[PDB]
């Protein structure tokens, strides 16, 4: 059975990804700060039974990889999706951001996702896929982030760290994906649904399985420029 | 006369840039945390006299723009170079970097440089040049930063913030340069000066090295 780990699965796109992988017959491990308070996860569990396993965890805690390891046991991870993202300060103003907000923005969106992926990487199947929720706002060539510079810069830093990780290998043992989910209703009147976005992202993730490449793609599996 | 402001001019490439612009006849305003403790700045001042003005200021403190304003007065800045950069933790390990180190790394290398440039931007000459010391390690396409991922990521964030700032304008009133310095200080500075001058009047965002060769994002 395909083991899929979705970090940040309580609602929105994270939940949608769990639902979409379950519909494909995967065993899904869904991590959230408070699994039990998620009506979406509770409804998935009632439908999927033991094939959906909830993990209490937070990417920003030091023990998160170990808590995940306890739930996985000997199981290898075929697909690892880190779905983390905060906006940062609402003002998105370099003149105002303080040390605590800076630390929180770059730890949450860039450093902690790599930290967790790396910690678990030894359990990832050869020819598997490790994917990070990124953003079109990370793209320097598209340069679309003027109204949210801090968020975009945090996601550029994520993409940078991931590319640097790639550089440590002679040959990648799994694919490394940076994903743009689209402008998703309930995430960031938006018509693009969680279901459509999640279906698209799952297809993109599956398309990278066995390729062992680093790609920056959207929910249509179209490449984004760096 | 060209007014050139170099933020972070106490030593190394910052100092070299001050020297190189002075040799071209510019009026140079050189900012350092402790100008008086810099033998390099002190020797430049003795040689250039009033053409070098030293400014006490720290990019990481919120009073830096005001200290600069006191030296500049009403004069417009033709060239603004922000020379900042720390390595971050020696381990360069995402498993080890804590909140205080993260804040320090991204404030120093990305946020504070933009913050200062923005604060001063209204004084920059139309068709002038605002430049940031970046790194080839910032480039995602070159992907060179495996041994220093935190440093690289901090400079990618700098490049991102600068590109975003570009996007706030109807039209750029000055060029925005991200510079990779490279291997002597003198050669690097001579090259960067030529690159900065080449962008005057262009009003573009460019990521270039000491040879003025474009680097991919």
3-state SS of B113-129 is HHHHHHHHHHHEEEEEE
CB-nearest partner of B99 from A103, A141, A226: A103
Q: What is the resolution of this structure in A?
A: 2.0
A167 to B143: CB separation less than 8 angstroms, yes or no? yes
**Structural contact between residues B162 and B82, judged by C-beta atoms closer than 8 angstroms:** no
Distances (CA, A) of A89 to A86, A155, B106: 9, 14, 15
B145 to A164: CB separation less than 8 angstroms, yes or no? yes
For chain B, helix, strand, coil in percent to 5 are: 45, 20, 35
**Structural contact between residues B124 and B174, judged by C-beta atoms closer than 8 angstroms:** yes
What does the alpha-carbon distance between residue A185 and residue A26 come to, in Å, rounded to a whole number?
A: 25
With tokens 């070098």, the residue in question is B52
With tokens 């100092």, the residue in question is B15
**Structural contact between residues A30 and A83, judged by C-beta atoms closer than 8 angstroms:** no
Six-digit token pair at B57?
Answer: 């200021």
CB-nearest partner of B156 from A99, A160, A167: A160
SS3 assignment, position B3: strand
Residue A174 pairs with which residues in a beta bridge? A128
User: Which residues constitute the domain of residue B60?
Assistant: 1-217
**Structural contact between residues A28 and A51, judged by C-beta atoms closer than 8 angstroms:** yes
- Looking at the 3D structure of chain A, how many domains does it have? 1
**Structural contact between residues A63 and A115, judged by C-beta atoms closer than 8 angstroms:** no
In residues, how long is chain B?
217
With tokens 């799952």, the residue in question is A202
What's the order of all strands across the beta sheet hosting B205-209?
Answer: B52-56, B27-32, B3-7, B77-82, B124-133, B174-180, B205-209
Residue B201 half-sphere exposure, CB side, CA atoms within 13 Å?
Answer: 2
Identify the DSSP state of A107.
I
Residue A97: which of A143, A153, A159, A144 has the closest Cα?
A153
B111 to A99: CB separation less than 8 angstroms, yes or no? no
Six-digit token pair at A65?
Answer: 């990889």
Question: Is the backbone of residue B58 left (phi > 0), alpha (psi -120 to 50) or beta?
Answer: beta
Cβ-Cβ contacts under 8 Å, A139 against chain B: 217
What CATH number is associated with residue A223? 3.40.50.720
Helices (H), A56-175: 64-72, 99-106, 112-120, 149-167
**Structural contact between residues A80 and A8, judged by C-beta atoms closer than 8 angstroms:** no
Q: Which residues of chain B have a Cβ shorter than 8 Å from any chain A Cβ?
A: 94-95, 97, 99-100, 102-107, 110-111, 114-115, 118-119, 138, 140-141, 143-146, 148-150, 152-154, 156-161, 163-168, 216-217
A106 to B107: CB separation less than 8 angstroms, yes or no? no
Is A164 labeled as ligand-binding? no
- Give the determination technique: X-ray
Burial string for A80-113 (b: 16+ CB within 10 Å, else e) reads bbbbbbeebbeebebeebeeeebbbbbbbbbbbb
Distance from CA of B208 to the nearest CA of A (A): 14
Cβ-Cβ contacts under 8 Å, A141 against chain B: 217
Non-local CB neighbours of B169 within 8 Å, separated by 6+ positions: none
What does the alpha-carbon distance between residue A164 and residue A60 come to, in Å, rounded to a whole number?
A: 21
What does the alpha-carbon distance between residue A83 and residue B216 come to, in Å, rounded to a whole number?
A: 28
**Structural contact between residues B212 and B191, judged by C-beta atoms closer than 8 angstroms:** yes
Looking only at Cα atoms, what is the longest distance across chain B? 51
What does the alpha-carbon distance between residue B44 and residue B49 come to, in Å, rounded to a whole number?
A: 8
What does the alpha-carbon distance between residue A135 and residue A150 come to, in Å, rounded to a whole number?
A: 12
In residues, how long is chain A?
226
What does the alpha-carbon distance between residue A105 and residue A9 come to, in Å, rounded to a whole number?
A: 20
What does the alpha-carbon distance between residue A48 and residue A28 come to, in Å, rounded to a whole number?
A: 10
Q: Which helix (H) or strand (E) holds B130?
A: strand B124-133
**Structural contact between residues B97 and B150, judged by C-beta atoms closer than 8 angstroms:** yes
With tokens 């969106």, the residue in question is A109
Residue A109: which of A148, A159, A143, A184 has the closest Cα?
A159
SS3 assignment, position A32: strand
B interface mutation test: which of A103, A108, A138, A155 has the most B CBs within 10 A? A103
Six-digit token pair at B97?
Answer: 């970097």
With tokens 């730890």, the residue in question is A107
Is B47 labeled as ligand-binding? no
What does the alpha-carbon distance between residue A162 and residue A112 come to, in Å, rounded to a whole number?
A: 12
Q: How many CB atoms lie within 10 A of CB B4?
A: 25
Identify the DSSP state of B109.
I
With tokens 């001050």, the residue in question is B18
Q: How far apart are the first and last CA of chain B?
A: 34
């Amino acid at each position: 059975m395909h083991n899929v780990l979705i970090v940040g699965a309580s609602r929105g796109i994270g939940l949608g990804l769990a639902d979409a992988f379950l519909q494909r017959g995967a065993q899904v491990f869904a991590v959230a700060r408070r699994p039990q308070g998620s009506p979406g996860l509770q409804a998935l569990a009632e439908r999927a039974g033991e094939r959906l396993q909830a993990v209490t965890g937070d990417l920003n805690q030091h023990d998160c990889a170990e808590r995940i390891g306890e739930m996985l046991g000997e199981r290898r991870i075929d697909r690892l999706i880190v779905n983390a993202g905060i906006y940062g300060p609402q003002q998105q103003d370099v003149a105002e951001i303080d040390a605590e907000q800076t630390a929180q923005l770059f730890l949450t969106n860039a450093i902690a996702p790599l930290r967790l992926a790396r910690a678990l990487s030894g359990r990832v199947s050869r020819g598997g896929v490790v994917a990070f929720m990124s953003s079109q706002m990370a793209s320097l060539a598209l340069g679309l982030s003027a109204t949210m510079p801090l968020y975009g810069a945090s996601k550029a830093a994520l993409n940078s760290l991931v590319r640097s990780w790639e550089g440590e290998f002679e040959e990648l043992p799994f694919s490394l994906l940076l994903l743009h989910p689209g402008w998703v209703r309930t995430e960031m009147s938006a018509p693009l649904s969680v279901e459509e976005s999640a279906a698209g992202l799952v297809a993109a993730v599956e398309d990278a399985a066995g390729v062992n490449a680093c790609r920056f793609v959207d929910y249509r599996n179209q490449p984004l420029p760096w």
